[PDB]
Amino acid sequence: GDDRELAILATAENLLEDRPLADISVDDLAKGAGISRPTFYFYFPSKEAVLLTLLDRVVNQADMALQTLAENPADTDRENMWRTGINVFFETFGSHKAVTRAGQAARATSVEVAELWSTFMQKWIAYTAAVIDAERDRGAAPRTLPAHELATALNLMNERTLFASFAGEQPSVPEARVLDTLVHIWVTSIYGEN
Amino acid sequence: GDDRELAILATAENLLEDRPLADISVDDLAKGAGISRPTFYFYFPSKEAVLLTLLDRVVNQADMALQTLAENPADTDRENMWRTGINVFFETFGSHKAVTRAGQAARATSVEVAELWSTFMQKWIAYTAAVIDAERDRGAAPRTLPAHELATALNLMNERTLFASFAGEQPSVPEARVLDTLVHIWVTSIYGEN
Ligand SMILES: [N-]=[N+]=NCC(=O)N1CCC(c2nc(-c3cccs3)no2)CC1
Numbered sequence: 001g002d003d004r005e006l007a008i009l010a011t012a013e014n015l016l017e018d019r020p021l022a023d024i025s026v027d028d029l030a031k032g033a034g035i036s037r038p039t040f041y042f043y044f045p046s047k048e049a050v051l052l053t054l055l056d057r058v059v060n061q062a063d064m065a066l067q068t069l070a071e072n073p074a075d076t077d078r079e080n081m082w083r084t085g086i087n088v089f090f091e092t093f094g095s096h097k098a099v100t101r102a103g104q105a106a107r108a109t110s111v112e113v114a115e116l117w118s119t120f121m122q123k124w125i126a127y128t129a130a131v132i133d134a135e136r137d138r139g140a141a142p143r144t145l146p147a148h149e150l151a152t153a154l155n156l157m158n159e160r161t162l163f164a165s166f167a168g169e170q171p172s173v174p175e176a177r178v179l180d181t182l183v184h185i186w187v188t189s190i191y192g193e194n
Numbered sequence: 195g196d197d198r199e200l201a202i203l204a205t206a207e208n209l210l211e212d213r214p215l216a217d218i219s220v221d222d223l224a225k226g227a228g229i230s231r232p233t234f235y236f237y238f239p240s241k242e243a244v245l246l247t248l249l250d251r252v253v254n255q256a257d258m259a260l261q262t263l264a265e266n267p268a269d270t271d272r273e274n275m276w277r278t279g280i281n282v283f284f285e286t287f288g289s290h291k292a293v294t295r296a297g298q299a300a301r302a303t304s305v306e307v308a309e310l311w312s313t314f315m316q317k318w319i320a321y322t323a324a325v326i327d328a329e330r331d332r333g334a335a336p337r338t339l340p341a342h343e344l345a346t347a348l349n350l351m352n353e354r355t356l357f358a359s360f361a362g363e364q365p366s367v368p369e370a371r372v373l374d375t376l377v378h379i380w381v382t383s384i385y386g387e388n
């Protein structure tokens with residue numbers, strides 16, 4: 001029963017590797033999950049609702065990993081601190097590229113998907129700004145731009161850059177260079193007097 | 195004749211302020227342009243082709259303005275140099291918000307629109323990287339990240355951040371704070387040793 005929902009989710013993630021949600025049928029999902037097409041509809045109203053659940057699980061997985069870092073002290077240099085945080089997102093989204101990609105596209109056509117992404121981006125921006133404010137408070141970083149504004153542009157950069165890399169977009173930073181690229185830009189803009 | 199094509203283009207830009215391309219009909223465009231619906235089809239195959247032409251004109255307008263800066267010496271401090279260049283894009287795209295917004299959305303559904311955007315982004319990245327290399331060559335900026343990689347992430351940040359601002363997205367940087375935000379991040383990451 002609960003195993004049937006998990007089998008629907010696992011099947012959808014697998015097939016999204018191969019083709020867009022547009023070219024996946026409910027029949028495909030039902031067949032991969034070992035249930036009938038009418039039984040599918042007991043668990044989800046649509047293939048679009050299945051993608052929303054997949055995206056929700058990934059975004060929460062990233063959020064929980066970030067909470068684990070936040071809870072620790074972690075004796076570290078400032079560049080390494082930011083690197084480990086950025087790495088949470090690079091690894092979580094990069095381990096679920098097909099779901100990431102389909103999820104980003106569905107933001108244009110789905111109000112629920114648009115809202116889910118917006119909600120977590122707001123949360124992740126507020127935490128970034130809180131960390132920058134703390135750095136400023138102990139005299140480790142200079143009082144330059146408004147911290148929330150700085151944090152917003154840095155996060156939108158990470159969104160656009162990570163996803164362009166994962167999709168093999170033209171133009172993009174090579175996947176093997178993206179972490180180093182983002183970390184340099186974060187560290188210089190947060191600690192730089194100019 | 196050539197005035198009829200320009201009237202079709204002017205009408206489309208105006209109506210895009212009010213509503214998405216989805217809710218604009220060929221009848222609307224033909225009526226605003228003072229021609230019949232069959233006469234429209236002499237000039238364009240579709241309302242989608244009209245948007246492509248509008249986007250092409252805007253992107254070329256930005257590109258030409260950047261060329262004018264490139265051609266000058268312009269006796270300036272380094273922060274002011276980058277500011278005037280970033281301002282080209284903030285002002286050009288920000289003077290054509292409806293076309294910008296519709297154009298960005300059409301990248302998902304139109305190969306021609308996707309290609310046009312990709313082509314100009316590549317050009318703008320290559321010029322950014324050439325300027326950073328020149329700065330490094332005269333000893334004004336440190337040899338840190340590969341310049342083309344640095345230039346790619348900085349440009350993708352500007353894309354995502356400008357367009358989120360213009361659309362009133364949640365999250366976004368206020369339109370009145372976006373130029374200062376981007377300039378700080380560009381200057382510190384290009385000139386910062388760390
Ligand atoms: N795009 N996107 N995803 C969001 C994204 O890329 N982020 C980068 C790291 C940010 C951050 N790291 C940290 C800490 C690291 C170590 C201790 S706290 N605090 O905020 C969280 C959001």
Ligand SMILES: [N-]=[N+]=NCC(=O)N1CCC(c2nc(-c3cccs3)no2)CC1
Pocket residue numbers: 260263264275276278279280283318319321322325349350352353356
């Ligand atoms: N997104 N987007 N649009 C692209 C964008 O935002 N750009 C920012 C400025 C870049 C640039 N400026 C300059 C110069 C300024 C002054 C002399 S050269 N050279 O490269 C060009 C591309």
